[PDB]
Amino acid sequence: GNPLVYLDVDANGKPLGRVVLELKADVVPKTAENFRALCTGEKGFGYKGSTFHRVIPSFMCQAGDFTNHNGTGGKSIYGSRFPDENFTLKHVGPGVLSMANAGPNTNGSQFFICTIKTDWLDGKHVVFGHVIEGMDVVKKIESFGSKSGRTSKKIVITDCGQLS
Ligand SMILES: CCOC(=O)CNC(=O)NCc1cccc(-c2cccnc2)c1
Ligand SMILES: [K+]
């Protein structure tokens, strides 16, 4: 079945809760496997201890830059970047999990969780999952963002992994 993974998130060292995500390995197996492996840390690197570096209320919460912690880094389990797998899944609403990028075929490790429908990203960002549980946790993260994307507290994925 599709992986179920989790991110345990804190704000300045205080726990906000758990976000549980389904990864659509059935539609985007390579993108799903990348994220799954970065949650478990099984390749020797990943998301544990990294931050939500860009959080824009009424838009999305962005994370996964585990090298530079600011949107300029990250890498995949494959290499520094990998191709856009397909654009089959769309940005249909809040809770969509999608790859951040710097243009075509630049996926690494950065990702975003949508807090609104972001349909203008369809065909540009590879959607690969959605929130199963903890949209209230996403909403708390969203609360610490700003229109500039800068966060008012340090938002940290303190643990992460695979449930099934
Ligand atoms: C809502 C999603 O928004 C975005 O993706 C907007 N764009 C960014 O944030 N770009 C920053 C970004 C995102 C993903 C990969 C890279 C990258 C690629 C290659 C080498 N180094 C870094 C950069
Ligand atoms: K805007």
Tokens standing for residue 133: 């549980």
Q: Which ligand is nearest to the CA of 58?
A: 2
Resolution in A: 1.8
Mutational pocket test of ligand 1: of 110, 118, 120, 147, the residue with most ligand atoms within 8 Å of the beta carbon: 110
Tokens standing for residue 156: 């940290």
Q: Which ligand is nearest to the CA of 103?
A: 1
| Pocket lining: 72 vs ligand 1, CB cutoff 6 Å | yes
> Hey, what's the torsion of the CAs at 85, 64, 33, 143, to 10 degrees?
-90
For tokens 């809040």, the residue is 94
48 φ, ψ (degrees, to nearest 5): -60, 130
Closest among 105, 98, 102, 88 to 125, alpha carbons compared: 98
Residue 151 CA to residue 125 CA, distance in Å, equals 23
Q: What experimental approach yielded this model?
A: X-ray
Chain centre to alpha carbon of residue 133: 14
Range 47-67 burial, b when 16+ CB lie within 10 A, else e: bbebbbbbbbbebbbbbbbbe
Tokens standing for residue 151: 């966060």
| Pocket lining: 81 vs ligand 1, CB cutoff 6 Å | yes
Residue 40 CA to residue 48 CA, distance in Å, equals 8
Tokens standing for residue 106: 């630049």
1-164: CATH architecture? Beta Barrel (2.40)
Residue 133 CA to residue 128 CA, distance in Å, equals 16
Environment class of residue 26 by beta-carbon count within 10 Å: exposed (0-12), middle (13-18) or buried (19+)?
exposed
| Pocket lining: 56 vs ligand 1, CB cutoff 6 Å | no
**Residues 162/55, Cβ–Cβ less than 8 Å:** no
| Residues in contact with 44: Cβ distance below 8 Å, sequence separation at least 6, in sequence order | none
Residue 129 CA to residue 127 CA, distance in Å, equals 6
Three-class SS of the chain: CCCEEEEEEEECCEEEEEEEEEECCCCCHHHHHHHHHHHHCCCCCCCCCCEEEEEECCCEEEECCCCCCCCCCCCCCCCCCECCCCCCCCCCCCCEEEECCCCCCCECCCEEEECCCCHHHCCCCCEEEEEEECHHHHHHHHHCCCCCCCCCCCEEEEEEEECC
Query: Does the active-site annotation cover 62?
Result: yes
Write down the catalytic residue from 101, 111, 128, 144: 101
For tokens 């726990």, the residue is 15
For tokens 């700003």, the residue is 146
